[PDB]
Amino acid sequence: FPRVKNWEVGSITYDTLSAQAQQDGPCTPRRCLGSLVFPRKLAPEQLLSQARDFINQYYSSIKRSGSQAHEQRLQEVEAEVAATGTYQLRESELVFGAKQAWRNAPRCVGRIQWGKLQVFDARDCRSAQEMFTYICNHIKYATNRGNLRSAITVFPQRCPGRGDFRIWNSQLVRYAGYRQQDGSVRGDPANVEITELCIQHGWTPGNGRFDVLPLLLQAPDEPPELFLLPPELVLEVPLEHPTLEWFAALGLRWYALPAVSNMLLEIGGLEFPAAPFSGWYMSTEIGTRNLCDPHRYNILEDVAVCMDLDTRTTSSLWKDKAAVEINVAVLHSYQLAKVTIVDHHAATASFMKHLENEQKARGGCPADWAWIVPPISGSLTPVFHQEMVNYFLSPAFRYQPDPW
Amino acid sequence: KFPRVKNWEVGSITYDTLSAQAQQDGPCTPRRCLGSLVFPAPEQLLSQARDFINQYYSSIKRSGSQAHEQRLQEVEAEVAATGTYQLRESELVFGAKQAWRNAPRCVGRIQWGKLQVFDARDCRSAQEMFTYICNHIKYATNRGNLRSAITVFPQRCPGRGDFRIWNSQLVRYAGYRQQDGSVRGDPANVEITELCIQHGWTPGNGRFDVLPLLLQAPDEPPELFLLPPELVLEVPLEHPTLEWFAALGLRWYALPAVSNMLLEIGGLEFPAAPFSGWYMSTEIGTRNLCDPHRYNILEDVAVCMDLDTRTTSSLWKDKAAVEINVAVLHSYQLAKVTIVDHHAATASFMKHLENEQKARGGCPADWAWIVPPISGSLTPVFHQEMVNYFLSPAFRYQPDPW
Numbered sequence A: 001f002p003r004v005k006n007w008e009v010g011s012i013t014y015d016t017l018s019a020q021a022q023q024d025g026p027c028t029p030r031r032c033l034g035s036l037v038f039p040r041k042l043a044p045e046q047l048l049s050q051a052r053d054f055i056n057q058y059y060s061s062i063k064r065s066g067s068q069a070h071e072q073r074l075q076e077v078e079a080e081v082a083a084t085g086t087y088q089l090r091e092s093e094l095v096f097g098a099k100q101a102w103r104n105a106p107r108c109v110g111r112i113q114w115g116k117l118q119v120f121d122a123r124d125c126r127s128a129q130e131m132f133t134y135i136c137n138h139i140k141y142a143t144n145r146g147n148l149r150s151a152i153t154v155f156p157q158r159c160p161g162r163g164d165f166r167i168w169n170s171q172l173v174r175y176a177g178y179r180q181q182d183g184s185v186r187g188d189p190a191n192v193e194i195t196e197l198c199i200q201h202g203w204t205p206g207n208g209r210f211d212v213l214p215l216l217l218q219a220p221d222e223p224p225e226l227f228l229l230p231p232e233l234v235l236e237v238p239l240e241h242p243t244l245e246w247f248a249a250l251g252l253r254w255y256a257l258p259a260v261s262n263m264l265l266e267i268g269g270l271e272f273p274a275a276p277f278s279g280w281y282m283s284t285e286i287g288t289r290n291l292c293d294p295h296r297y298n299i300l301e302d303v304a305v306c307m308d309l310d311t312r313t314t315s316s317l318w319k320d321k322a323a324v325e326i327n328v329a330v331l332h333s334y335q336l337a338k339v340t341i342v343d344h345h346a347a348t349a350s351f352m353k354h355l356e357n358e359q360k361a362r363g364g365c366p367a368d369w370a371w372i373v374p375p376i377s378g379s380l381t382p383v384f385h386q387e388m389v390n391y392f393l394s395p396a397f398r399y400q401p402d403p404w
Numbered sequence B: 001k002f003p004r005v006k007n008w009e010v011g012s013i014t015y016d017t018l019s020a021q022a023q024q025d026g027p028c029t030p031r032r033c034l035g036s037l038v039f040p041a042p043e044q045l046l047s048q049a050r051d052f053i054n055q056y057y058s059s060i061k062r063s064g065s066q067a068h069e070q071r072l073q074e075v076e077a078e079v080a081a082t083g084t085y086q087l088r089e090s091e092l093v094f095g096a097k098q099a100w101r102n103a104p105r106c107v108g109r110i111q112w113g114k115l116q117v118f119d120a121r122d123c124r125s126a127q128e129m130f131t132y133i134c135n136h137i138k139y140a141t142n143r144g145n146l147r148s149a150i151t152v153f154p155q156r157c158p159g160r161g162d163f164r165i166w167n168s169q170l171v172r173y174a175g176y177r178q179q180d181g182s183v184r185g186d187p188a189n190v191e192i193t194e195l196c197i198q199h200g201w202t203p204g205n206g207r208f209d210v211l212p213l214l215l216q217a218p219d220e221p222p223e224l225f226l227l228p229p230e231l232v233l234e235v236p237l238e239h240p241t242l243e244w245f246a247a248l249g250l251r252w253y254a255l256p257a258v259s260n261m262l263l264e265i266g267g268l269e270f271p272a273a274p275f276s277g278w279y280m281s282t283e284i285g286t287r288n289l290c291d292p293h294r295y296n297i298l299e300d301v302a303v304c305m306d307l308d309t310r311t312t313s314s315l316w317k318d319k320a321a322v323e324i325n326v327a328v329l330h331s332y333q334l335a336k337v338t339i340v341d342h343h344a345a346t347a348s349f350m351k352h353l354e355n356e357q358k359a360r361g362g363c364p365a366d367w368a369w370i371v372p373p374i375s376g377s378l379t380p381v382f383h384q385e386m387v388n389y390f391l392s393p394a395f396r397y398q399p400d401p402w
Ligand code: HEM
Pocket: A098, A102, A105, A107, A108, A109, A110, A111, A113, A117, A150, A151, A152, A277, A278, A279, A280, A281, A282, A285, A342, A347, A371, A397
């Protein structure tokens, strides 16, 4: 059982939860690959085994292991797989399953909220048209006029012997990236292939730097159909700085609802390829990674010129001065627009609170150090001086190949 | 199936073939990663010696020669005879450099080829130890123009105790325990400070009192030595445009000289082998000055900067931090003492990775240590996937002699 020390406080805990780790990770005794983003890849005998452990995990959660309901529910799932080769989750289980996947997510610093999650059940969906309507309800509910509310939306489980539900966009809201004559990119360079795929499937492109893409939605064994998001459903925050008046004139924007839509959800050996979830942004996500990554909006230098910083030399720490005010601008703008946002300090301190909670409840917490530590001011946050143990528990969110 | 490694800012992809030759195991398994943890015979000694001798004779492009083969014979012959063997002067120099080269948590390794190796394997007492250490400090410091060096003392050997330096660095500041639980000076050195006093040292009452050295010769208690004040070069910390900052009375020392690690070469162990380079400014400004368990000046500074300290969203911590780092860099440049910022550091380390991929087919690197403790994703090492593993020769941690 791994020993884990917090070097800021001196405290020691033992991670007994690691012992119950399902799938094997990329690391081996002879090399650590903990920093890789995607490592490696991407029978009723087995499906039943994953179903059973999940069921047990459910009744355990609700004080009812060994009960009448438990025994009955175990026999029910078995009979179903025997007859059909798959089984169906009771709604309550689905809810639990979604919450556990969020809880078990090693890279998510926001898991203090893991218990508070709205779950929309779209397993009865089977057209691409109102797969889109299902998405619109989500975006509407979760945006909630800017008082953001965590939610997930579960579409039908994959069936062998006819195709998957997929959402071709990686987020429900993303900005267009237009390949240029230079080879350069106007807009967001992260979203270039999806901008490409949008045009080829019919979308008439825009002109600017912040054009919200159209959703590419695919129902089983059909080709993806393009829909447009009603502009009044896509809430955006114009970026302004509380003291640097020129900042607004840069015309930067970002959207309110971070909603990841290209990850597969797995519960008890059932696999859900289309299941968009959303919470709310940590300002460092927008202000540092999105706006300041050299391969993203890459604005850093522009902001520095505006601040009249010494960009002649790295040791002015101009990159650092400018990054901070960009982050300041994000938090200020979002607060002014009454949109829920959390700063990297508030966020990391609650995650500490979460580690302590998780200790008492499950004897540890799977946590990926590199993803929990913010991309600015790392050691100024408490999670930096905290030893972490990364491992895989199920239910989970897993990456998947892109449908094309 | 060697590991596939990607740079995510550029799109470069390489395969770390070097990693397959990892000599030892780390803390990780397929079940769980433990990569963020801080602290994770003759046949056996021979096979390491054999591998190191092969390393050396390849670097001097003489692999498979008969100088190469005969060296193996006499190593195996000297292990048979006396249960051990001695490094040639030349091999010692190769081995110390490689150790730096193989150290996964060092961002400064572009410089690995330029390392001054001082051979003190004939040292005989703590007094001589002191003399050797002073000359290191004078050579490495160089009136501000810092130079990389390592002084290698006698290897571990049977029938005789170790040479040990009890301090974790040649230059550290005392931390005096007050009975508020409060600490005057650097709190990370509370332990070394009372050890010193227990071995007959008259303490101070300042926040920056340079500690004496506690040096251990075989089968001998440690012996106290005071560093001549004119040898410990320090830098008063002021800020280019925050004039009140100077009034904090803050300083830091020129020369970062780690002295408690074990240098292992070809199976031989050197428990006392102090090495040094020059500072990366984040070590000083972010970790040593801002860690809550270190000097912890962050809020004092923010309050003087008139920052709003009652809410986290004002990002007071981040601003005050950046300014402490500006003040460090500015003071060191002002005082003409070598120092590197974290953008230049990580930049040159990117080059090192490139050199190393061409040279040995990869490089061990501890991501969580290579990324600066401020402004991570602002630097190029953040977006670079890395493979962490253990090669020999190496610097290893080792227990405190007390
Ligand atoms: C409610 C507020 C939330 C905050 C502030 C938050 C914060 C974050 C952040 C900053 C990341 C790192 C993302 C990146 O750097 O690319 C992350 C990752 C992640 N989040 Fe959360 N999150 C929240 C809610 C949620 C919800 C509602 C879910 C799903 C139910 C979720 C599941 C995940 C998963 C699975 C990852 C890992 C993604 C990956 O491996 O790339 N989080 N979260």
